[PDB]
Amino acid sequence: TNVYADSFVIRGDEVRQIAPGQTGKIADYNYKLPDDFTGCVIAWNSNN
Amino acid sequence: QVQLVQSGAEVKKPGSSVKVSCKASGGTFSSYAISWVRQAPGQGLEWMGGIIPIFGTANYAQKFQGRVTITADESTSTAYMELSSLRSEDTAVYYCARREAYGPRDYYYYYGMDVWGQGT
C-alpha cells in the first residue's frame, strides 16, 4: 500500500535492539518496533 | 569540607615540560569530573582537558591534543598533569577544577565547578 522509511543514528551495540521483541533503553524509550512488524531493518557503519 | 589544593608556582624556560599536581582531601574521590583550565593574563579562560579517575580515560582540547598529558592517581587521591613544548604564549595561571557527581555515573549528570584550585 505505502512504505514508511524511518531513520535515526544509534550506537553500535544498540543495532540489535531495533527488532521486534527487544528490550533496552532505545527499544523502550526512543523507537519501539511492533511485534507484528512487516519490513526490513537496514543499518550500516557511518563512523566516517 | 572537600577541597582541592595543588603545588606551588613553577617557572620554566621555553621548550621544557611542566608537571602540575592536584591533591584531593575530603569526599568520595574518583567520582569527580576533574577538569584542567587556564586563563591568559588579560584574556578569557581557555579549556585544555579533563579526566574522570574511575574511568581512567583523559580528554583533551584540539589546541592542546598531542601536547598535554593528564593522569589521575587513585591511590593518592591526586590528579596529575604533564604539559610539554611550552612557548611564549603558554605562560598563564593554571587551575584544577572539580564537579560533583550524581546519577548513574556512566552518563553525564554533574553539578557545577563549586570548588577550584589556588592557582599554579
Place this chain on the structure above:
Amino acid sequence: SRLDPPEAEVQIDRLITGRLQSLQTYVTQQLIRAAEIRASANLAATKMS
C-alpha cells in the same frame, strides 16, 4: 503477571493448544457417550410403548 506480552504470547499459545485439545477430547467423549445414551433412550421408549 510475570511475562511481558511479546513472550507471554508464546506461553499462552502453548496453554491454548493444550486446553483446547483437552476440551475437544471432552466434547468428543460426550458426543459418543450421548450417542450410546440415545440408543438406550430409544430402547427405553420402545419398551415403554
Place this chain on the structure above:
Amino acid sequence: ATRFASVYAWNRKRISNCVADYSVLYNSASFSTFKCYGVSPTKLNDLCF
C-alpha cells in the same frame, strides 16, 4: 562491590526478608546487559519471590 569472585569459584550472596526495589536497579543507566528469562524486566517490581 570491590572484590568480585572468580568464575571457577563464584560467590553467592543470599538476599531475604527485605523489600526489593527494582526500579533503581532496572532504571539504572550503568548496566549494559539486563536480559531476563522467565520474568519480564519491566514487570519485576510487581512480583514477590
